[PDB]
Amino acid sequence: VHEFAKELDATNISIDKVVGAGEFGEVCSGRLKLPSKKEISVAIKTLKVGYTEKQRRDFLGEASIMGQFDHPNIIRLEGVVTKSKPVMIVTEYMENGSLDSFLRKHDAQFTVIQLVGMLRGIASGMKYLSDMGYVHRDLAARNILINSNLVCKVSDFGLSRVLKIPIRWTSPEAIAYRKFTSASDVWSYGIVLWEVMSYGERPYWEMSNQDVIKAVDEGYRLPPPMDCPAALYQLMLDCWQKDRNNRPKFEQIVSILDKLIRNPGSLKIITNLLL
Ligand SMILES: CCCCn1c(-c2c(C)ccc3[nH]ncc23)cn2c3c(=O)[nH]c(=O)n(C)c3nc12
């Protein structure tokens, strides 16, 4: 674990607020003093008191993975505290929290270009993740964090693996026989793209799991979010191709969004499951 995660000294960490509760213990905010004396805001995940040895391994397991990525669109690990208690994972602070809950508070309040900027960041981070040989397997708006400048970053590597499961975000073939590839992450990205353009609407609403699985398999797809640019809806559909080999690669997705960011006059054509 200390291969990719530097041990931090607890005296350099101030805790200034309990901000949430994770799968493993509280999540807080605070500050970290770096060796250069610079002070930065950080998110701090704590491991619950009474943790079993297993929980400790899983908890720090996420840090070992996170510590492998250094990219502007992947949550940055600052380090871990293990030589004292509570055990902690320290990451950069994202002032605007989870992307889905953020967008829900701002229904229709952003411009197409702003939403596309968010989406470009996510794709860029996923491009790097897939470049590194990892499948995320849990790519969803709730696992994207957004900072004070609207920069979006991939997080939560709990289910991530080198090359249970959230049914709504998982590709047909991964649901069918656990075929997880980068192309199954591209499927998830398509769902994320839908979440963004829908400002945090839940994928497939409250349909039963059984029906989500069946409908998608039969070729049904989420419908165009209100006022969704045709270009972006078609990108969802491309991400949701039945043949995984026909989905774009994250590199192509980045390229597509980069173009849309340029001529927003592309975005002027505007568009129950669709067959
Ligand atoms: C996907 C989010 C899981 C919990 N987590 C982590 C985090 C931490 C601290 C350690 C490992 C992690 N893996 N993935 C995230 C993560 C950092 N943050 C923040 C945050 O920085 N700002 C905020 O406003 N909120 C709400 C935050 N919530 C978290």
Q: Percentage helix, strand, coil, to 5, in the chain? A: 40, 20, 45
Name the residue at shortest CA distance from atom 28 of ligand 1. Answer: 97
Q: How many CB atoms lie within 10 A of CB 71?
A: 16
Instruction: Name the helix (H) or strand (E) containing 61.
Output: helix 53-66
Cβ contacts of residue 68 below 8 Å, gap of 6+?
A: 4, 132, 134
Resolution in A: 2.1
The tokens describing 178, both together, are 């656990």
The DSSP string of 238-260 is: HHT-SSGGGSPPHHHHHHHHHHH
| Spatial distance between the Cα atoms of 86 and 101, rounded to a whole number of angstroms | 28
The tokens describing 77, both together, are 């690990």
Asked whether residue 21 is marked as a ligand-binding residue, the answer is yes
Which residues of the chain form CATH 1.10.510.10? 95-275
Active site residue 70: no
Instruction: Name the helix (H) or strand (E) containing 20.
Output: strand 13-21
The residue among 229, 137, 226, 259 whose CA lies nearest residue 187 is 137
DSSP state of 84: S
Cβ contacts of residue 75 below 8 Å, gap of 6+?
A: 66, 91, 92, 94, 145, 153, 154, 155
219-238 burial: b if 16+ Cβ within 10 Å, else e: ebbbebbeebbebbbebbeb
CA distances from 196 to 172, 192, 193, 250 (A): 21, 6, 5, 17
Give the number of the atom of ligand 1 that is nearest the alpha carbon of residue 90.
9
Q: How many CB atoms lie within 10 A of CB 108?
A: 8
The tokens describing 182, both together, are 């980068």
Name the residue at shortest CA distance from atom 21 of ligand 1. Answer: 93
Does ligand 1 lie within 6 Å of residue 69's CB atom? Answer: no
Asked whether residue 112 is marked as a ligand-binding residue, the answer is no
Phi-psi region of 149 (alpha: psi -120 to 50; beta: other; left: phi over 0): alpha
- Helix 182-197 vs helix 250-262: crossing angle, to nearest 10: 30
| Spatial distance between the Cα atoms of 56 and 67, rounded to a whole number of angstroms | 16
The residue among 6, 1, 257 whose CA lies nearest residue 152 is 257
Does ligand 1 lie within 6 Å of residue 91's CB atom? Answer: yes
CA 16-21-24 angle, 5° bins: 110
Pick the CATH number of 95-275 from 3.40.50.1700, 1.10.510.10, 3.40.50.300, 1.20.1070.10: 1.10.510.10
The DSSP string of 101-129 is: HHHHTTTT-S-HHHHHHHHHHHHHHHHHH
At 90 the three-state DSSP class reads strand
Write phi, then psi, for 20 (nearest 5 degrees). Answer: 175, 180
Amino acid at 17: K
- Helix 230-239 vs helix 250-262: crossing angle, to nearest 10: 180
Asked whether residue 26 is marked as a ligand-binding residue, the answer is yes
The residue among 241, 224, 245 whose CA lies nearest residue 182 is 245
Cis bond before residue 86 (omega within 30° of 0): yes
Q: How far is the CA of 92 from the centre of ligand 1 (A)?
A: 8
Q: How far is the CA of 271 from the centre of ligand 1 (A)?
A: 35
CA distances from 163 to 4, 129, 172, 256 (A): 19, 11, 18, 26
Q: Are 90 and 220 in contact (CB under 8 A)?
A: no
269-272 contact pairs (CB < 8 A, 24+) = 269/229, 269/230, 269/231, 270/227, 270/228, 270/229, 270/230, 271/224, 271/228, 271/229, 271/230, 271/233, 272/223
CA 79-82-88 angle, 5° bins: 55
Q: How far is the CA of 43 from the centre of ligand 1 (A)?
A: 6
**How was it solved?**
X-ray
| Spatial distance between the Cα atoms of 7 and 85, rounded to a whole number of angstroms | 13
Which residues of the chain form CATH 3.30.200.20? 1-94
Cα 42 vs. chain centroid, distance in angstroms? 18
Asked whether residue 59 is marked as a ligand-binding residue, the answer is no
Task: Note the CATH number of domain 1-94.
Answer: 3.30.200.20
Q: Are 113 and 231 in contact (CB under 8 A)?
A: no
Residue to probe by mutation, ligand 1, list 155, 156, 157, 160, most atoms within 8 Å of CB = 155
Looking at the DSSP bridge assignments, the partners of residue 30 are: 15, 42
Q: Are 197 and 265 in contact (CB under 8 A)?
A: no
Q: How many CB atoms lie within 10 A of CB 123?
A: 28
Residue to probe by mutation, ligand 1, list 91, 138, 152, most atoms within 8 Å of CB = 91
Give the number of the atom of ligand 1 that is nearest the alpha carbon of residue 45.
9
The residue among 230, 252, 229 whose CA lies nearest residue 239 is 252
Give the number of the atom of ligand 1 that is nearest the alpha carbon of residue 95.
24
Cα 121 vs. chain centroid, distance in angstroms? 10
Give the number of the atom of ligand 1 that is nearest the alpha carbon of residue 19.
26
